[PDB]
Design a protein around this nucleic acid. Structure first.
Lengths: 107, 119, 568, 98, 137
DNA sequence: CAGGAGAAGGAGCAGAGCG
DNA sequence: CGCTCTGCTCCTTCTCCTTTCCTCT
RNA sequence: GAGAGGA
């Protein structure tokens, strides 16, 4: 995780996603002052493993292309650093329905 | 606006030929040497059609009969697998379909220089 | 009037939409291999680089065993060029390409056998010409052969020795080469592989500079690229001398196939001889022919050093290729020759005494003078390296050969005025209609007619110079250029489509009248046509055979006409 | 919190964008005294924010949601959508109500 | 220009002038002339490479002046333009310093090898499998 | 005849590498 | 060490929509 | 075609 101070040259961004085994991420110091997950409007995200994703897909008889996707580089996605194809379970709280789970995948 | 080099007589119907009218000069009568090539072009091709590597295709009743018995098999069909193969050339995944462990048999494509064309 | 219900049937309009490459390749494979192989080749051409799973998915005949049998049939006949790449993230997969050289070999079979028979001075002896014809036929039809199988097929010791000697002679001549996995690997992907293992291995210290690092990688990669390209052409297998009786014998275990590059170099030599026959006398043409035959084995490859296809040409250093080629084109030891060698090998049947007039056999001076008159012409038939030493410049002879063939095709199809206009526009550059009339001296009406009939092909290109804010006509001017690359590519595609159409018609006619053709071999009744079949069947079979003969003769002519555009 | 939905989407993820959409629609329709059940608002928010990003109900946000060429042509920009489906050779399976 | 008739460039006079200039060049650049080809290409002889077989523009000017076939005064530039026009059609091969010597193809065409297309015969009537240049266009 | 929102080219600078 | 591409980012100038229809005249 | 109710 490379927390740059003020600005990133686009050439650095070009060089960023070229490592087969490993990966690197960029975080602005201004973008990291109050973590997004502690905001009132950001529901609790949970990263689901391969086994949990398989269990969910078998339970709802879905595929990896039908769940409501969440974009990569989403502020609550790059926070957890979800890789492409990882399911995140969201504990969404509504005043008329209590808490309930909604699922997303990273694309 | 009719152009300078045109008149109303030549315009009015849009007749496109739809048929070619400019032929290449390669349509002349064949020569004896050219007649030879052909044979070595008809013969080749015929041999590979008879060759084991064809798989071209994209009565036969199940009732036993004494008539079909005592009749010879049409030929000794040579499948693709029976041909000898240089294993180091082919991809590995195709090994399950070849004759990796099968009796060796190679067919010789004899060449008859005499033309098979009638007259 | 011809209704569309008849136009769709007797106008060849349904096939006029097919891509010439896909049409030709699919038709050839269907004629020589079958329908499953034709479908697989069609998928390979249409999509490109399909694995077995994708081939199964994209074809209705999705039997995995059927697809694998088709793939082995195409691989043994090297009609495909597979590739085994390893996925770092997991399971490896092997992708198949379409092999152009194998399909060309299927295309040039008759010409290949004719060249094999004629070039080797064995048709004169009349006894082993049949043996070498059978050898080349089996090699070209079965794909790859090892000599021990062919020898074990025959029984006679004399026949075995003759076949082994012919194998050795053919391999030495260059028409037969050892087949390796390099023949089943795309040149572009081979260069991609060789770019690494020479760029990655550079230490992580400061390399000269990133551009200079890439330059070093390219310079190191070109060396072993050329080395591995020429590795099959080193005759490292024929030198199994003295297993017994101390004779030159080919190694039994080495598989041998036909060298398409050698045959295409022979075709280029024949094309150059035909061109020279339109510029010098018959005797001088014979001298040029024998010089080409002497230098044919050592000549550079017809297509390219195989580096043009591999990567991007360059920023502008692509000329280096030319220069590098030119260097070898001038410095390969076999290329350079003097009149002494030609006189040594010149046939005695050539007069070569009164052919040349001094002012208004096998003499060295006369042969040198004929070489000088060959080199004197504006067409670079021969070029002078040292005083009295000549070499045939292939680099400077391809463009003129292509231009002459294209100009004469235009002259034959359209009028001679079309050739005049094309050559006038080519010699000039961006010439208006008034200057065309001034420097061509013919009617402007026919000038415009020929220009309009010629722009239908990529022969003459219109450059629009707008004289207003809007580029609409009646105010702008229209100059004319040539753009010879467009013309060559378009004519090559046109000839490919014509050849595909001829083959399609031949196969259709064979299928339509297949009943009597099948009867001709139902009971081995060949050679007994008049004494067993009805006269109507006799006439029908005669007409079918004559039509097929004419089809293949026209295919041979089309090949002789399109090889030049295939060159590079 | 701001009124702008897209700003919340940019700075706080997509779930916060959905929450903001639902809450702002509910507030606008409650300040006006109208009684619309919040479940319809939640369905609208989910429809807007289920492809991954906030997508409008214009002819631009619909083109990124529904693949069906005939439905998009029926709604808006008919000829452009039909010509694009002819060019890219789309293969829609008719399952929508339109 | 002197070659214009009724405001348009006629061809008949131009064609005759081209023919006579071509014949003059062919005679100059060959040992004996057309009678070297009455027997055929199996016996014809050619000039040595060291000889000056070409014919400059001035020789053509002298020939057209002494022949009086053009019937009008022709400047060397006009004859140069005319023979440059004749350079096309693979006639009157151009040599440096404004020299001309006829091509062998030009005299071969007076009577597969695509180059000598004139010898090949047209296709028979009502014959299928005949190759057309514009069948694909 | 107004209002809203995208797609496509000029255009003016950072940034990188360089011989 | 200026020089010269790329590349990015503005900036401007362009295009496609605006209930229901329900009549008559 | 376009002028205007109308709900």
């Amino acid at each position: 995780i490379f927390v740059y101070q003020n600005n990133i040259t686009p050439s650095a961004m070009k060089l960023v996603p070229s490592i087969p085994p490993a990966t690197i991420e960029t975080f602005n110091e201004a973008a990291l002052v109050v973590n997004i997950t502690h905001h009132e409007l950001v529901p609790k995200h949970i990263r689901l493993s391969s086994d949990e994703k398989r269990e969910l897909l078998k339970r709802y008889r879905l595929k990896e292309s039908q769940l409501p996707r969440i974009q990569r580089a989403d502020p609550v996605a790059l926070y957890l650093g979800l890789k492409r194809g990882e399911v995140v379970k969201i504990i969404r709280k509504s005043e008329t329905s209590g808490r309930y789970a909604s699922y997303r995948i990273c694309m | 606006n009719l152009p300078f080099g045109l008149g109303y007589g030549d315009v009015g119907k849009n007749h496109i030929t739809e048929f070619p009218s400019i032929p290449l000069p390669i349509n002349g009568p064949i020569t004896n040497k050219e007649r030879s090539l052909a044979v070595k072009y008809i013969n080749f091709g015929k041999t590979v059609k008879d060759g084991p590597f064809y798989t071209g295709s994209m009565t036969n009743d199940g009732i036993e009969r004494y008539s079909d018995k005592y009749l010879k098999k049409r030929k000794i069909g040579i499948s693709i697998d029976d041909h000898p193969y240089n294993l180091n050339l082919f991809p590995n995944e195709l090994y399950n379909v070849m004759g990796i462990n099968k009796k060796k048999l190679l067919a010789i494509s004899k060449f008859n220089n005499a033309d098979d064309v009638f007259t | 009037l011809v209704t569309p219900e008849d136009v769709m049937t007797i106008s060849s309009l349904e096939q006029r939409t097919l891509n010439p490459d896909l049409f030709l390749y699919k038709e050839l494979v269907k004629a020589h291999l079958g329908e499953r192989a034709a479908s697989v080749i069609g998928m390979l051409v249409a999509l490109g680089r399909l694995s077995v799973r994708e081939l199964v998915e994209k074809i209705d005949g999705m039997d995995v065993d059927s697809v694998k049998t088709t793939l082995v049939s195409l691989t043994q006949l090297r009609c495909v060029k597979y590739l085994q790449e390893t996925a770092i993230s997991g399971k490896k997969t092997t992708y198949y390409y379409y092999n152009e050289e194998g399909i060309h070999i299927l295309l040039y079979s008759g010409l290949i056998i004719d060249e094999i028979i004629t070039q080797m001075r064995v048709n004169d002896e009349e006894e082993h010409k049949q043996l070498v014809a059978e050898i080349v036929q089996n090699v070209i039809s079965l794909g790859s052969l090892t000599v021990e199988d062919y020898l074990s097929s025959v029984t006679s010791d004399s026949m075995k020795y003759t076949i082994s000697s012919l194998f050795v002679q053919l391999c030495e001549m260059g028409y037969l080469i050892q087949i390796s996995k390099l023949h089943y690997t795309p040149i572009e992907d081979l260069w991609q592989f060789l770019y690494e293992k020479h760029y990655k291995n550079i230490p992580r210290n400061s390399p000269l500079s990133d551009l200079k690092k890439r330059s070093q990688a390219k310079m190191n990669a070109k060396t072993d690229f050329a080395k591995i390209i020429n590795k099959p052409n080193e005759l490292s297998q024929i030198l199994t001398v003295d297993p017994k009786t101390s004779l030159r014998i080919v190694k039994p275990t080495v598989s041998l196939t036909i060298n398409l590059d050698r045959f295409m170099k022979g075709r280029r030599s024949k094309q150059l001889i035909n061109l020279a026959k339109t510029r010098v006398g018959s005797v001088t043409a014979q001298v040029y022919k024998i010089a080409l035959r002497l230098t044919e084995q050592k000549s550079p490859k017809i297509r390219d050093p195989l580096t043009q296809t591999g990567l991007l040409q360059d920023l502008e250093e692509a000329k280096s290729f030319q220069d590098e080629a030119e260097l070898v084109e001038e410095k390969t030891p076999g290329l350079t020759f003097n009149a002494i060698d030609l006189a040594r090998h010149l046939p005695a049947e050539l007069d070569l005494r009164g052919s040349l007039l001094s002012r208004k056999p096998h003499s060295a001076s006369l042969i040198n003078s004929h070489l000088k008159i060959l080199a004197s012409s504006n067409f670079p038939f021969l070029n002078e390296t040292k005083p009295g030493v000549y070499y045939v410049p292939y680099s400077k002879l391809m463009p003129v050969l292509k231009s002459s063939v294209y100009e004469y095709v235009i002259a034959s199809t359209l009028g001679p005025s079309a050739m005049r206009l094309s050559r006038c526009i080519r010699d000039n550059k961006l010439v208006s209609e008034k200057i065309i009339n001034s420097t061509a001296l013919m009617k402007e009406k026919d000038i415009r007619s020929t220009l309009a009939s010629l722009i239908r092909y990529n022969s003459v290109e219109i450059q629009e110079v707008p004289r207003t804010a809007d580029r609409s006509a009646s105010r702008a001017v229209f100059l004319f250029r040539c753009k010879e690359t467009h013309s060559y590519n378009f004519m090559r595609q046109n000839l490919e489509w014509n050849m595909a159409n001829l083959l399609f018609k031949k196969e259709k006619l064979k299928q339509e009248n297949s009943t009597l053709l099948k009867k001709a071999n139902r009971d081995d009744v060949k050679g007994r046509e008049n004494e067993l079949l009805l006269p109507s069947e006799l006439n029908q079979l005669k007409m079918v055979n004559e039509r097929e003969l004419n089809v293949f003769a026209r295919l041979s002519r089309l090949l002789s006409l399109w090889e030049v555009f295939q060159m590079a | 919190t701001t009124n702008h939905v897209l700003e919340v989407f940019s700075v706080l993820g997509i779930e916060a964008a959905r929450y903001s959409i639902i809450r702002e629609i509910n507030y606008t329709m409650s300040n006006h005294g109208m009684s619309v059940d919040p479940r319809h608002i939640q369905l609208l928010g989910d429809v807007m924010t289920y492809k991954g990003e906030v997508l409008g109900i214009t002819r631009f946000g619909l083109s990124k949601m529904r693949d069906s060429v005939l439905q998009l042509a029926s709604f808006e920009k008919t000829t452009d959508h039909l010509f694009d489906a002819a060019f890219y050779m789309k293969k829609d399976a008719v399952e929508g109500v339109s | 220009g002197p070659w214009f008739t009724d405001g348009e460039l006629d061809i008949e006079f131009i064609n005759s002038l081209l023919t006579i200039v071509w014949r003059f060049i062919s005679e100059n650049t060959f040992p004996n002339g057309f009678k070297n080809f009455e027997n055929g290409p199996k016996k014809n002889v050619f000039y040595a490479p060291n000889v000056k077989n070409y014919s400059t523009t001035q020789e053509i000017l002298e020939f057209i002046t002494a022949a009086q076939v053009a019937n009008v005064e022709l400047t060397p530039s006009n004859i140069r333009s005319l023979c440059e026009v004749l350079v096309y059609d693979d006639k009157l091969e151009k040599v440096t310093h404004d020299c001309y010597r006829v091509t062998l193809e030009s005299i071969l065409q007076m009577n597969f090898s695509i180059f000598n297309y004139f010898k090949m015969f047209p296709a028979s009537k009502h014959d299928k499998e005949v190759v057309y240049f514009d069948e694909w266009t």
